[PDB]
Amino acid sequence: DTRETMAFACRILAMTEQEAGLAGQISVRSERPGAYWTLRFGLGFDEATPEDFIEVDRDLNTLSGEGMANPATRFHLWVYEARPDVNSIIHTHSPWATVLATARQPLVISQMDMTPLHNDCAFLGEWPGVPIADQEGVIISKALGDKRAIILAHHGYLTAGKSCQEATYLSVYLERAARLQVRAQAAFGPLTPVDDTLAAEAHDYLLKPSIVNATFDYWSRQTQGIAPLT
Amino acid sequence: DTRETMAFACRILAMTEQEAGLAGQISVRSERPGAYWTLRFGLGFDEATPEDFIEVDRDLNTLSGEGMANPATRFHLWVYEARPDVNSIIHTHSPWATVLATARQPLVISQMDMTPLHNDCAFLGEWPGVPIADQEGVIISKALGDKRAIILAHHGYLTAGKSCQEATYLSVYLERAARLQVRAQAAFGPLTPVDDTLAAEAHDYLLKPSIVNATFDYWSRQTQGIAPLT
Amino acid sequence: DTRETMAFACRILAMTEQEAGLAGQISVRSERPGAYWTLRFGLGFDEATPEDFIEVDRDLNTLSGEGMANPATRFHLWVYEARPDVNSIIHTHSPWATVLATARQPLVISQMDMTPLHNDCAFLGEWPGVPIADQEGVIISKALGDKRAIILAHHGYLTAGKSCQEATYLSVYLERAARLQVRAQAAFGPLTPVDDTLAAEAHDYLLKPSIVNATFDYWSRQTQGIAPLT
Amino acid sequence: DTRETMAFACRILAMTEQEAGLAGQISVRSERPGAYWTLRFGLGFDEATPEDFIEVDRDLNTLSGEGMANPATRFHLWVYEARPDVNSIIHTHSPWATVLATARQPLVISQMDMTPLHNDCAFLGEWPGVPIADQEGVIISKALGDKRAIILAHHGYLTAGKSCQEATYLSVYLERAARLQVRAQAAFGPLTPVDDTLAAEAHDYLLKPSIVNATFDYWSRQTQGIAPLT
Ligand SMILES: [Fe+2]
Ligand SMILES: [Fe+2]
Ligand SMILES: [Fe+2]
Ligand SMILES: [Fe+2]
């Protein structure tokens, strides 16, 4: 169930052009403390199948499945420790969110579909370079705080969801919000943010598990291919 | 016949890249007063088949077909009531039209293919947030007036056609006009509008049912796939 | 053979995202005086097969093949009359060339692949609206002069080649040159043109029939699909 | 082995959208001095198979394989002679890197994935036009110096790798870095470069042969097509 949900999540991120390459990371908190499920080393999101997700501990020992973990995902254990409510984490350097990261520009909530990130997207202004697991773990979990997402300056983004479906939903919506903002600002300059009270209400509406799960299942069907009409 | 046209209309909107999760809506005025045909809840445009369109009433009672309707489409009944000439409605948060909506920028008619929207695209400057069907329908039918289209600030757009073909035609042409304007303004600044007399003549020419229907049938063939040349 | 070249030309324009729709036009000068070969009415470039190209006269009578011609192509006879060297004409409202057209911005030759249009792209500043065949025919052939291409303000472009291969080559290179200029100007402002003497030499190099024909045959193979490596 | 690597490299360049007619070039230094392996004339990267790479000398004599080499690649022998450490060269006029070339804008290292080009991307400000193999070879090897890549003003780019995998990795990363910079600058103006010490460390990390080869093998699998989930 978990591995199948993760495989669909990777195919959705690939379909929506996150172009994660080998810089893409995904994890789901294990029922076993101190452990997490993750895509095995050397594979991209677009090729992930349920058998490519293994269960690993703090020392990168494979507890379940066949394969070796991407050591760059070890820092996810720090986020899971700081946030008991988080059950899934995605990190990519997706094209449009990375434009915001590179220009050191926070997300400005100015449209309905940008509201799942309203008061829910942190911004790490400092780029630590090539990191260590404990260095990145400490830095990201502190900068992220209680938010669902974080733009990592000169790097990419990270989403932290209460389920793999919510982390995927946040990743897709953040990338689309970033694209919308970059295209709008190039043509028209800085955006007028929407009213905070109305944006907080749209945030909770779009983040209802029923809508998150139905949207995830829709995107999952899309990855499998739809036959044209006869 | 109606459901078959609506299925093709959805595949055309999907082909021309209008997805934003499950935000896409389409309806056709039923022959039964006070009722409408619409895509059942949980489905995207790209997967719609004739059997996924059900006839629903003001209380979301499925009168024909199998399924539950998207409750977000209830406001369509207010538009149909205001506009007896309108028989099909499409609402999406398509990528380029949503850039105009987010930047609070009306469409500027400066090119031949933008003319079906000449003096035919309203602009709702106020974003109501998460709406109640009572208020959304009143707000949108009032702002739309007698026009064929409306850009909904911080939200997306809506098209209102005399047929499903015309609503689809207006949707594709609005999205392409918005893309053209955003790309032109990013490189060169504000556009010079074309002469109003010539634009109104091109508007009526491009909106002739023979041209609207032939274009819709062409796009329908495209969605089915074309075999390469041998 | 002529119709097979035209069928491949249409598939190439479709592959390279000219999104010609029903606004796309293509012709080849007939061996019979006062006649031309053209895509029959109601069809897009992406679906054109050799049997869809019919021979037509000044009164739109079908002399060869099955079908009715697009009456909007009648003005091509005026271009053929003004230019005995021209044997093929393509007119589309392709996405990037139409940005230049809409912003009333001539092409600025600043890169190797833009040189086939160096001193070879006219600009019609006046938009005549919905035209008459004699009106458009006289206007375009006079504005085009002895050039291979013309940007038609608020409309699109037209290419005029000594062969169908050259008209196709000019269409693809003009669309790509326009995309390059719009992207460069949005990020960095107005371009510095390359030296005219060196650009005229690159123009003649890239316009050698051997290179035009080999590039056309390459694009033709691409439209047919290439099997992945095993 | 070398021919198979080159075939995959071409399919990767094609997948990552680097086409510009038949302007694409690729070579690998032969084990025989004074000779190189290259894609035979008239073929694009997307259709290359192992049998399309032939070994040729300075006079374009085919020493191995069947076919005629692209004479435009003759200048690659000058780069190989100047740089014993370089074993593969790629030259294309890819869309985004060519925007930087056309606007005479050097790459600004402001993001993690741009670091393989940190202090490793030369800029040739002078455009020589249609060149002789003679002067082109001298001009590009002098401007390239000891770097891995060079932006060629008003032309495109060239990458020079210690292996075909590294040349491919540098091309993909340069094209993506250029896209990121052009999109960021259009919306937000000039970028703030990352710290040089941290960028040099990320440069060496991302350029480790284990990472270069694993990424190349991943992209190779992607070109072959991945079946959707069941
Ligand atoms: Fe990363
Ligand atoms: Fe909506
Ligand atoms: Fe036209
Ligand atoms: Fe070149």
Author numbering:
A (entry chain B), B (entry chain A), C (entry chain D), D (entry chain C): 29 to 258
What do the authors say?
Here, we report the first X-ray crystal structure of a novel dioxygenase, AfPOD, at 1.76 Å resolution. The final structure model of the AfPOD tetramer contains 920 amino acid residues, 693 water molecules, and 4 iron ions. The N-terminal region (Met1-Arg28) and the C-terminal region (Lys259-Arg261) of each subunit showed no apparent electron density. AfPOD has a tetrameric structure with approximate dimensions of 60 × 40 × 80 Å3. The anomalous difference Fourier maps revealed that the metal ion coordinated by three His residues was confirmed to be an iron ion, as expected from a previous biochemical analysis. In subunit A, the iron ion is located at a depth of about 8 Å at the bottom of an active site pocket with an opening of about 16 Å long and 8 Å wide at the boundary to the adjacent subunit B. Imidazole nitrogen atoms of His119, His121, and His183 and oxygen atoms of three water molecules (W1, W2, and W3) coordinate the iron ion, forming an octahedral arrangement. The α1-β1 loop (Glu45-Ala51), which is highly conserved among PODs, is also located near the iron center and is fixed by hydrogen bonding between the main-chain carbonyl oxygen of Ala51 and the iron-coordinated water 2 at distances of 2.5  Å. A 14 Å-long tunnel with a 3.5 Å diameter opening at the central cavity extends along the interface between the subunit molecules to the iron center. Notably, the α1-β1 loop (Glu45-Ala51) forms part of the tunnel in subunits B and D. However, the tunnel is blocked by a conformational change of the Glu47 in subunits A and C, which probably prevents the passage of oxygen molecules.
